[PDB]
Symmetry: D2
Subunit: 440 residues, 4 copies
């Protein structure tokens, strides 16, 4: 299998039990779905349906695991009174492709399908929910979100770091927010849980529901998250430039840094797609610099070109601690360090190689600020439509995720305790090995 | 979910058991690899009712993977490849990935590419067959179509096996629709009848994503991307004219997965006509009229398999356009000036290079095809289901087909986006 | 030289003399340019500067021609009172890439540089200037045109065909329009002259100034017109698909129809750029179908693939008269006719070719409704900025054009009397010959 | 216009006459082509003052074209090619177009590609030289960089001519900046000194469009396209942050043509810093402050040759970013939260495949290079001026360089778009 699950190095849960996977529901479902009609009643869920966590049998087959995930879907009875609920939205953390699509789909689903009273968009991450920031909140309506999905970034703006929980819920009450969608990563969702808790503490009828993005932070759970496919498309473009460079320099080395904090899916997938990576360094396979110089040496033994792909989360054990504004582990710029090591190594071996050039490409911002591909737009629209369905039906303290080709609901405590990482003995990483230089 | 199953026009099985899903393996695996876990067909249970959930279905699907003990003698194996049917993005990625994995992970004796489908296997065509080596395939993944060439239609299995036998092929990879796979079974059967040690392994091809026991086929994602661009052009044209209608034809012989996904992805379609929901021209005209009551523009997406009651179909893109023009003429009073632009981006969708993501996909399918074939698998196709890679016998894969579920979340989204009758 | 000039087959002028090239100027220049300051006075023209029509010497060198074109530029003295002038805009004919960029640049130049009183945008071509249509006129302001250049088509809309001249000028007076920009082709500009005349007839202080587009109509004068470069980019994309198809079919023929009414620049240039065209048919080289079947036969004599590029204006002498709604010559669909002839020819020769497939691609709408490339956006912005400069300075009855890498002003009567056509003995067409199949 | 001339760091001429512009031709044109018109340097006159206008300048430029009588014996000529300096889009198109025109229009005896610039011509590198035939170049136009490889720096002309003489090269095409062209003259001179019948013909290369007697160089248009995409990303980042600053570095060692054009094309730059307008960091900070008085976002475009007073330059993209962060820190009171993102898309601009339009351009320049070279032209470069193709001696082309005219219509447009001091 291509990937596997491992405990996060900052997990809220020590071990996941069926109970940890139980999704919280605001008390009560006193309203029929405004879209449910006798003819389409078949399309609305009456009871919570599940799907196995691990569809592997032990040897009808029984799962190797006791865990079950709740499937997301439109419900026949809902918690909030449609024409009276107020939806809020905020995008936190770094930007990535698809944020505007999520904002647009949440907005249009609320207005068109639920005839919601109003949709509010908070500016620049949690700051927009602070006493001072609340002042900048805007009203999102059909006309304001019609063509935003054609641009990168977020029209709401974003920012890293949490805000005083007391202040944030204060503004949510002050504005009459019933559902708050938190779009963002690990830290973003940790804040979401804190807000959810503060609200629960005050007895306020509020749901906080997360729409996660992962390529740019420590979070990594779903088989697919919005923005990933677009990042791969652009990563490949960066890899092609790196290859053009490398092949154009006698003993030239094209170094391209890609995203990937604890997982190397982006790098691993761009490496295979481009079919032009010679060395691929991911977080799951931490190797020393001597082994890297060794792979390069083996490459330059029968070639004048070398393209090295390197995930930002790789080689963190190579040098000079703590967490950034979003709560992610601080990182040393492996892109810069590696490029230097390579230039030092080829320097001290100027005799084995007459001339040598090392070129470093960092396409980070061009990958993050890129507009989404059509396939991500479809995914973004679907993640968002289901998020509105489940939150209107009272789901709270959870994120909408995608596992085994199905949309599920996962409590935030679980989502931030486990990580989806490359299985070095999986089909994907085996292709990268086949394609890249071999130690032996 | 978003799809449902329906008996394929030509099914070999009319019900499925667990044995039907077990993959056929050539006898013996003596050689060590130069370097069977199952998955549930249906991961849904039946309730958190204390202790490990049991699947609602008895069926299990075998997972594709490289094996430690393989069937063919690596250094002595010859690989053959043929691409049949209509072209779609990724064919070259499949050819390349197969070639390089056989040449680099197994050091096979040689790789052979037969030209223009099964034609290239018959006495006559066998002449064009070419030797595939690293250099010949190293950069073909930047082009649309197939370097080998393709063609529709079967040939005599006797002649084809004569060809395989003469060229000493141990593994023949058949890249094509269920039609080319049906022929693959007939080739596999003739060979076993002669006692020849050859595996016939298929790699599914369909832009439609019509293939059962599958959630995604290569080329399908590239198509949605290009279809969306086409819709962008249709919208541009439509919005630029007073009472303008932009008609866009999209792939979709028996299913409307591309049209539906492209409709949601673009969020610019006003009417989406698919083969799973045939409707009268009267209704289409009523939907168009409804749209024009509150707008001066209308984008109409139509799948090639729609309106056949208005071996295969007739050009519905032209018929529809013709009737929209007529409908507007007849009402030139209500709609003073009107314009109808027709867009058929068909060959521009299936003939373009693959998107990076499809490239990754094609490469993975191919790499896994060689791993399971080298380990004896035959009479099956490689496929992707529930985010995992599985082997599926041909008789099962070609017995059923995927189609839109007019009640799934995908179609529900296009219904909300499009004009409604009531 | 790559191209040449020939008389139009519907010309208003029988012969062009220096007088025909004299640009009309509304009477009076009583205002200093609101942007001219002592420091930048150097940047504003005091007198009309010229450039040779034909920079070829006879043998300081003297031109082979007596003709001189007026150069476009910001003027020190202008005709209209800035804060009081009202600018109007209308886009007519078929759409092409760059219309929104022209609308945006005209609008922002008027507002930002001239502090114009208002900019009006007329809907759907001249119809928007009819008594009924005038009703739909919109007000264009900074906020309405900020991001339109990112989309294909025209936000104002377009339409073919003229309207009653009496009605159009009636609305221009009724709305206080001082400058009317006519964006479009041959027919578009013929209407512009008619409006200009009607206005002159009434003694109204109005300027009608044209911003031409050509790829989709009979017009063809400048060395470069907006939208052309983008059309070539897309045409090449269509040619690649046609090649993928052709090479994938035994004796397969990829037929792709491109724009080009009286000129084959698009086809000729896409043919060379793509380096994958085997046969290229343009209007300047009308050949019979027998000669085409002959070229295909020579191609299939040593190959299984044939890509045929065909300009819409080619082979009009191949069959079944008059003008369309925009005033262009009616055309028979050479794309369809040619594809049929090829299928008939390969049919009657099924013996020489076992199997054969002919695939026809018509990327017309995908080329016309495409957003502009960045280079066209730059060109569009510059054409439009200069158009506003010259019209504010009283220029009327003319179009802004580009010749020999310079922006010039050309009276409409001249622009519609001559055509820029491929010189079959020029460097461009010689490359196409080198690349394509040879008769001998 | 939009550019002006300035003495090149290393000019050979310090004034120009008509003789300097006349192209040097090898003696004799005996053979018929297997299948000199001038243009005015300045097409402006001096007044419609009755009867045929006379140019303000005496200079005339020779127009490139295929000739009926040529210098070399077609079937016996050997062609050599080398790409030097930094890579830019279109190099492969140039190599390909040269190869195919020589092989298809002249049937030259052979085409040779020397590797990694002039290095490939020295005794040592001469070893890597490869034979260029149809198949080896038929699809290289889909890749960035150069297949031949490139390198900066000169080699000994003695060794290089030894190489040319040994391999029997009649024509050597030098693709590179004025540096590689200066070296081309030195190669042409050594060869004539030995009495060897060889033409050295240059094809100008510069993303900057710095080359004099030229209005456009290949690669320049592709760069503007990619630069605009980079600016799009910078804007996205900037608009997404409270008081965000997106800093984008663009090609432009001594000129800011790319930055200026990309600034207007995108219409999203708030500050455009180019080498033709050096300014203090104090002023840049004042422009940024002005912007932040009425907005929460700021895009700053900066050419690599700007701020050198803050053989070549130091990374101004990093310096500028460093100082913007410091400037904002020092004013964290006025700007509570601020963010500075730096974008250096340099290698992604020059290492990508060419846009179709540049492809057309490269092909045309190349095709014309072979036509004039085969007809004896030497010591010159092919160029495009006033929409026409002309031949220009190297000594003239490398004596002057184009630079932005801060008073032309291009720069005036970026001034209007960007924040103003007053
Ligand atoms: Na190299
Ligand atoms: Na419309
Ligand atoms: Na073919
Ligand atoms: Na901002």
């Amino acid at each position: 299998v291509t990937s596997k699950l491992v405990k996060a190095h900052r997990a809220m849960l020590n071990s996941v039990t069926q109970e940890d996977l139980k999704v919280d529901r605001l008390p009560g479902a006193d309203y029929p779905n405004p879209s449910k009609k006798y003819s389409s009643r078949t399309e609305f869920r009456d009871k919570t349906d599940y799907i196995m966590y691990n569809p592997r049998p032990r040897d009808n087959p029984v799962s190797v695991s006791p865990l079950l995930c709740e499937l997301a879907a439109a419900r026949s009875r809902i918690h909030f009174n449609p024409t009276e609920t107020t939806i809020g939205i905020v995008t936190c953390g770094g930007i990535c492709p698809g944020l505007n699509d999520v904002i647009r789909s949440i907005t249009l689903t609320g207005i068109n399908v639920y005839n919601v009273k109003r949709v509010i968009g908070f500016r620049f991450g949690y700051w927009g929910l602070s006493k001072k920031g609340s002042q900048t909140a805007i009203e999102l309506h059909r006309g304001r979100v019609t063509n935003i999905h054609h641009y990168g970034g977020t029209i709401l703006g974003s920012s890293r770091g949490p805000q005083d929980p007391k202040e944030m819920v204060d503004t949510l009450e002050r504005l009459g927010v019933n559902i708050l969608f938190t779009v963002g990563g690990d830290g973003t969702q940790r804040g979401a849980l804190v807000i959810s808790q503060e609200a629960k503490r005050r007895g306020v009828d509020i749901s906080v529901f997360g729409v996660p993005k992962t390529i740019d932070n420590d979070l990594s759970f779903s088989h697919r998250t919005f923005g990933f496919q677009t990042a791969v498309e652009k990563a490949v473009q960066a890899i092609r430039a790196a290859y053009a460079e490398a092949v154009s320099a006698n003993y030239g080395v094209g170094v391209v840094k890609l995203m990937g904090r604890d997982s190397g899916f982006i790098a691993a997938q761009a490496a295979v797609a481009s079919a032009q990576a010679n060395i691929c360094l991911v977080p799951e396979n931490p190797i020393s610099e001597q082994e890297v110089m060794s792979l390069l040496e083996r490459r330059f033994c029968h070639s004048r070109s070398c393209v090295i792909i390197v995930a930002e989360g790789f080689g963190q054990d190579w040098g000079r601690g703590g967490y950034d504004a979003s709560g992610n582990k601080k990182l040393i710029d492996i892109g810069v360090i590696l490029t230097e090591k390579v230039k030092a190594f080829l320097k001290a071996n100027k005799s084995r190689y007459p001339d040598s050039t090392v070129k470093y490409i960092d396409p980070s911002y061009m990958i993050r600020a890129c507009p989404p591909s059509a396939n991500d737009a479809l995914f973004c629209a679907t993640l968002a439509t289901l998020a509105v369905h489940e939150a209107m039906a009272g789901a709270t303290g959870c994120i909408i995720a995608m596992r085994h080709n199905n949309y599920i609901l996962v409590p935030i405590k679980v989502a931030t305790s486990v990580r989806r990482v490359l299985d070095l003995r999986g089909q994907l990483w085996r292709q990268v090995r086949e394609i890249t230089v071999d130690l032996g």
